[PDB]
Amino acid sequence: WSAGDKHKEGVNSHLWIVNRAIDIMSRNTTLVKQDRVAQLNEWRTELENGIYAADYENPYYDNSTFASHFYDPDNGKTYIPFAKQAKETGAKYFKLAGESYKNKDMKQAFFYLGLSLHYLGDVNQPMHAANFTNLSYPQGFHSKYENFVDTIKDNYKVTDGNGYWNWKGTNPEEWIHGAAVVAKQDYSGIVNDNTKDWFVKAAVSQEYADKWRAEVTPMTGKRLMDAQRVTAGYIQLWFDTYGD
Numbered sequence: 590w591s592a593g594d595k596h597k598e599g600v601n602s603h604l605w606i607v608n609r610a611i612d613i614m615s616r617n618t619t620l621v622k623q624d625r626v627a628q629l630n631e632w633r634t635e636l637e638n639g640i641y642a643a644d645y646e647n648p649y650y651d652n653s654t655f656a657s658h659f660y661d662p663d664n665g666k667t668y669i670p671f672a673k674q675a676k677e678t679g680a681k682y683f684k685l686a687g688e689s690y691k692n693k694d695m696k697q698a699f700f701y702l703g704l705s706l707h708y709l710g711d712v713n714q715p716m717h718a719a720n721f722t723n724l725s726y727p728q729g730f731h732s733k734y735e736n737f738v739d740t741i742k743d744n745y746k747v748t749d750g751n752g753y754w755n756w757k758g759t760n761p762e763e764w765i766h767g768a769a770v771v772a773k774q775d776y777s778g779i780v781n782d783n784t785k786d787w788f789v790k791a792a793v794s795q796e797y798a799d800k801w802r803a804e805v806t807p808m809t810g811k812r813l814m815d816a817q818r819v820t821a822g823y824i825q826l827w828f829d830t831y832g833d
């Protein structure tokens with residue numbers, strides 16, 4: 590997903606996803622200790638810096654190839670042979686964040702948490718869970734799709750307190766893998782012969798530009814909502830694990 594501005598949701602789908610996940614935690618009055626949301630807000634600048642940094646600098650964006658931002662659950666690889674993927678990378682920052690949290694280094698802790706949340710968010714994007722890049726056929730579709738998402742994302746907010754609490758085990762890799770599995774199952778709802786043909790025709794036809802956008806909207810909504818619920822459960826796991 591996009592992460593265009595450090596502290597604005599406008600063209601930053603990643604931040605939007607995290608903010609909506611936090612809202613789910615706030616809405617829950619049965620099992621969530623609200624002081625956890627207070628801490629995320631206290632160190633929000635750092636959390637957002639981490640969410641943004643993943644797509645802007647090394648080592649996070651791998652020399653502008655973004656290889657660590659992809660993860661196919663069926664073969665466990667990213668799109669570049671031998672490169673690090675999103676599962677191991679997301680888990681890495683989940684643990685670094687937690688160790689810093691226990692050591693009372695809050696800025697370090699929430700910066701790393703933000704990075705981890707970014708990688709978890711990415712595997713929820715079907716293209717990232719299936720190694721479909723902006724160079725994949727049809728080339729240019731990946732970037733156009735993620736920019737389009739920003740124009741409609743705010744219409745798919747989860748409005749209840751039902752995050753996926755204890756969705757997977759205590760291992761963050763299990764959560765990232767699990768999210769990638771669902772995202773890949775949903776891949777054909779975004780990338781198929783129809784959306785491919787229409788995207789290409791959109792080059793010279795406004796009608797087809799609107800056609801592929803409409804076609805991918807329902808599944809986009811599903812992916813954004815699942816992303817919110819999974820992220821909420823993931824944050825809860827982090828505090829349950831490292832929260833004193």
Ligand SMILES: [Zn+2]
Pocket residue numbers: 590591592603710711
């Ligand atoms: Zn992304």
Ligand SMILES: [Zn+2]
Pocket residue numbers: 590714717731735
């Ligand atoms: Zn992308």
Ligand SMILES: [Zn+2]
Pocket residue numbers: 590643644655658707711
């Ligand atoms: Zn990314």
